[PDB]
Structure formats: C-alpha cells, structure tokens
Design a protein around this ligand. Structure first.
Ligand SMILES: C[C@@H]1CC(=O)Nc2ncnc(N3CCC(c4nc(-c5ccc(F)c(C(F)(F)F)c5)cn4CCN4CCCC4)CC3)c21
Length: 326
C-alpha cells in the first residue's frame, strides 16, 4: 500500500507566517521525528480569489523540480477544506530578516548568494523550460547551513524553450522588469533583471528603484541609470548595470547562451559552476540555530501567537509523496 499523508501524522509546533490564504506552521512528522514547514491553504480563499491557476502551477513546478537551491516539496495532500504543502524546513529564515539587520552584505556574501540563485535559475530555464518571474528578496530563504532556498513557484511560466515569449502581467511592482512594464511579449531574461534587483539590495542596502507612488517608481525602472556606493567595486557595478539594462536583448543573460552570459562575467571570476551546484562553496554565514524548533530567524509577530485551527476535481494532480528521505 502507497504511503498516505494526512494532517494527524504531524505535530503543530510554531506559527511562522499567517495571512488571507492561510498559514505556515513548523511541524514534526510523528513517525520519523523530522521537521517541515507546512503551508496550509484554505480551499475557499484560493477558489474565491482566482488563485487556483497559481496554486496548481506551484504544485506542478514543486513536483517536477529538484535543485539544491529550490525549495523542495516532501508531501502535498488535501482535506475537503484544506491544501497542504509539506515543505523542506529552511531554519535560516528569510534572507530579508538577515539583510534588514545587517543593512548590507559584503561583495563576497552577495557573490555566494547570487551564484546559488544563478545555479537555480539556469536549471529552471535550461532543464525545465520554466521562467520563474517572481525573483525578489521576499522569496529567498536560508537553509540550516546558510545556503539559499528560492520559494514561491506560483508565478512560474512552464513550456518556455529557447527565445519563447510570455504575456502575463505579474510580479512585485518594485521588482518588475522594464519589458514587463512596457507590456511587450517578454522572455526568460526577466529572471536576470530579478537577479540584478536582489544583488543590488544585497551589496547596496536599498532597492535600485523606489517611490511610494507606482507611476513614478516605473519611470525610474524605465529610465534612471542606477546610482551606486563609493565602497562598491567596479566588477559589482558592471554586474548590476549589466543585469539592470532596460533592454532584455542588451541585458546580461538576455542572449542565447542565457545564464552562461552571467556565469562568465568578471564579478564571478574564479567560481567553478559545477561546485556552486555541489554546495562545495562554504557559506559566508552559518545560521546559529540550536535545534529545529529554534525560530530565532523568524518573525516574533507569528512565533509568539498560539496555534488555533480556523470544487474537488480542480485540485486533481495536487497530491504528492517524494521519493527521497529526510
Ligand atoms: C513554507 C516556506 C517555504 C519553504 O519551502 N520552507 C519554509 N521553511 C521555513 N519557513 C517558511 N516560511 C516561514 C513563514 C513565511 C511567511 N509566510 C507568510 C504568509 C503570509 C500570507 C499568507 F497568505 C501565507 C500563506 F501562504 F501561508 F497562506 C503566509 C508570512 N510569513 C512571514 C512574514 N514574511 C513573508 C514575506 C514578508 C515577511 C514564509 C516562509 C517556509
């Protein structure tokens, strides 16, 4: 008999996040003593907000992908009223928690993270024919060793081989690529724009383009030549200007060699790309967690809270059990 996963096979320990569509809880599988982050989604709030397409895209990408820097789905199962994603638990918390406190990262620290993101995106593009589209600091986490985890696969576009184009208008206003705003028919190069915004935020301490009014913010993305700090070297200014070229064709990685264009840039000199993949590169920060229940790198606004528990043909191919252990 096939391994069946249900809610009662988990101990519900800590609230990590909570919102409109549901909540994230730190869980332990009773049978194995292993810890996971269960994302519980209210079937009604997904159905009501027209997020079914996104949820299923997330489940499909999660089932079909395996990379060290992509968050891994252990189990996905459902009740009459709930959608459950049993995710690999990232003990290092959100990268925003870490950058919000350090203000800036060293060139060497952003180098290490950017190379891991490059590895993951090269894989989605070259191997899986998937365009990620939602690369922002908000979707980056750290595992227990200090390696990057990219999360949130709902905004993915599948079946994109070669110079293939997309039409959807999605992403976080602040991270949206020029081509996306110009409402064109954009390609895989939107992920490299994303890489530039995140690495700028990393090495600089602020977004390259910001204004509270959406109209004005867009104009900066569309026109402003990126400002830089005096402490930042030239290689990093090149990479940033490179990924932040307004024209996807001009942009570093916008060419037919895709990620190879970025991997060869001077900022990445000396790195062995097969080693980036292999976690052979030593992390610049080691999360200082004492146990898996140590939620020091998580928001107290959720952790301190007490956990309280709050059509069918649509979520057909949702269920999953991974073939891997742990
Ligand atoms: C499942 C996820 C991904 C993974 O594979 N492993 C993992 N390991 C450890 N923690 C994880 N969590 C911790 C909680 C965090 C969060 N979600 C909401 C949250 C908000 C609204 C919602 F509707 C949901 C929902 F999707 F669960 F419904 C969660 C609020 N928060 C905290 C606040 N930050 C979010 C961005 C800015 C600050 C998301 C990341 C994960």
């Amino acid at each position: 008999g096939s391994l069946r996963v249900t809610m009662n096979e988990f101990e519900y320990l800590k609230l990590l996040g909570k919102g409109t569509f549901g909540k994230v809880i730190l869980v332990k599988e009773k049978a194995t003593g292993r810890y996971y982050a269960m994302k519980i989604l209210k079937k009604e709030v997904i159905v009501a907000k027209d997020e079914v397409a996104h949820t299923l895209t997330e489940s499909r990408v999660l089932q079909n992908s395996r990379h060290p820097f992509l968050t891994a789905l252990k189990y996905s199962f459902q009740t009459h009223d709930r959608l459950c994603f049993v995710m690999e638990y990232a003990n290092g918390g959100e990268l925003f928690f870490h950058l919000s406190r350090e203000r800036v990262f060293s060139e060497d620290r952003a180098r290490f993270y950017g190379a891991e993101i490059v590895s993951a995106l090269d894989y989605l593009h070259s191997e899986k024919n998937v365009v990620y589209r939602d690369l922002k600091l908000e979707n980056l986490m750290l595992d227990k060793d200090g390696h990057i985890k990219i999360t949130d696969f709902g905004l993915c576009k599948e079946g994109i081989k070669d110079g293939a184009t997309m039409k959807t208008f999605c992403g976080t206003p602040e991270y949206l690529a020029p081509e996306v705003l110009e409402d064109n028919d954009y390609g895989r190069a939107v992920d490299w724009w994303g890489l530039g915004v995140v690495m700028y935020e990393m090495m600089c301490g602020r977004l390259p383009f910001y204004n509270q009014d959406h109209e004005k913010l867009f104009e900066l993305i569309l026109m402003e030549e990126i400002r830089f700090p005096r402490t930042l070297g030239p290689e990093a200014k090149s990479l940033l200007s490179g990924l932040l070229k307004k024209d996807p064709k001009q942009r570093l990685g916008g060419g037919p060699s895709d990620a190879k264009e970025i991997m060869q840039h001077r900022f990445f000199a000396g790195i062995v790309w097969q080693h980036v993949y292999e976690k052979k590169l030593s992390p610049p920060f080691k999360p200082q967690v004492t146990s898996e229940v140590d939620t020091r790198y998580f928001d107290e606004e959720f952790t301190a809270q007490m956990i309280t528990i709050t059509e069918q043909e649509m979520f057909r191919d949702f269920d999953y059990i991974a073939d891997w252990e742990g």
